[PDB]
């Protein structure tokens, strides 16, 4: 099922997923339009809230995030355009502060700012969400995104994909950070694995052979859960950052584009690629020369991966 995985031709769609924004006339326009280009997966892609970095409690559901009928709703409508379905739920803060930098001083006490407390909120929220993929014919599913401080708590990442498993019976995936496919100890618990592959311009050339090791010492395939650039000047040397400042360059990220393409071998280890990303509410293309975002959409980047994925299907 893993080893025989077609090749991901890939897309997320709809980053934060807040409430009620599914279920919109724009959405559905917004993921048609992402149906036109030659893609074979989209991956539904929301963020419960945490307050601060050190609080145990999640919320999810309305009213922060879309609910589960919204996403059906999406799911529904991908699934009819021909589209293979990831569902990646995930953790945002509200104070702005990245999930790959949560904390707890505490390792033990359910009521207690712990690490198990804060588990058993996460657990929960996957358990739910891998209930939500069944219902819906999801044919991924992503337990994790980025989540860099929590993964030396390994005997609670195995609790939480073992629930997973007892509510889903589909592909199941980790998506680590870059540079920490070497570091993950819970690979043999997923079926495959996932980076958010944010590598500079000029670090593709001489990433390929780490990740190369990791796929192979592992015997599992590897694909990007996340990989993108923006279109901003200097962009391309901190692909991973959103809010770095630099005027409007689409060249840019379509410079990103070619030098992963370029350096990325055909080798059966590779999976594929899931772009970041693609919003719920898209731009028209004649608005694209002014946007600075990760979308592709009506930017040169667009024909490149067009182009690139087009091949990979024929
Ligand atoms: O990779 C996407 C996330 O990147 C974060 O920034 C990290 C970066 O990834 C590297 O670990 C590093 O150069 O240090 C940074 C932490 O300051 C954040 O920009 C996140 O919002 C991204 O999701
Ligand atoms: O920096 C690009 C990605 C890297 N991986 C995680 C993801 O959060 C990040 O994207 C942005 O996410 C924030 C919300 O977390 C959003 O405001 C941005 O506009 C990007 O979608």
Avoid at 246 to 271: H, S
């Amino acid at each position: 099922s893993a080893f025989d995985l077609g090749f991901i031709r890939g897309m997320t769609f709809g980053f934060v997923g807040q409430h009620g924004t599914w279920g919109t006339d724009e959405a559905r326009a917004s993921m048609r339009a992402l149906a036109e280009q030659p893609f074979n997966w989209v991956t539904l892609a929301f963020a419960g809230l945490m307050e601060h970095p050190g609080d145990p409690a999640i919320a999810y559901g309305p009213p922060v995030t879309v609910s589960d009928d919204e996403i059906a709703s999406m799911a529904e409508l991908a699934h009819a355009l021909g589209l293979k379905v990831c569902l990646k739920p995930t953790v945002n803060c509200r104070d702005g502060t990245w999930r790959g930098e949560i904390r707890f001083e505490k390792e033990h006490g359910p009521d207690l700012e712990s690490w198990e407390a804060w588990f058993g909120s996460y657990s929960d929220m996957m358990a739910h969400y891998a209930h939500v993929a069944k219902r819906t014919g999801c044919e991924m599913f992503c337990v994790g995104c980025e989540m860099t401080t929590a993964e030396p708590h390994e005997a609670m990442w195995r609790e939480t994909i073992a629930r997973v498993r007892t509510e889903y019976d589909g592909l199941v995936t980790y998506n680590c950070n870059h540079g920490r496919e070497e570091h993950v100890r819970f690979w043999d618990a997923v079926d495959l694995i996932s980076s958010s592959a944010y590598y500079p311009i000029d670090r593709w050339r001489d990433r390929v052979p780490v990740l190369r090791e990791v796929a192979e010492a592992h015997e599992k395939p590897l694909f990007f859960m996340e990989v993108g650039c923006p279109s901003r000047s200097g962009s391309g040397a901190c692909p991973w950052d959103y809010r770095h400042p630099g005027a409007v360059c689409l060249d840019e990220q379509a410079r990103f584009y070619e030098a992963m393409f370029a350096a990325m071998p055909d080798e059966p280890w590779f999976k594929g690629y899931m772009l970041w990303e693609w919003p719920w509410k898209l731009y028209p293309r004649e608005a694209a020369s002014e946007d600075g975002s990760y979308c592709i959409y009506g930017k040169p980047a667009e024909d490149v991966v067009a182009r690139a994925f087009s091949a990979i299907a024929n």
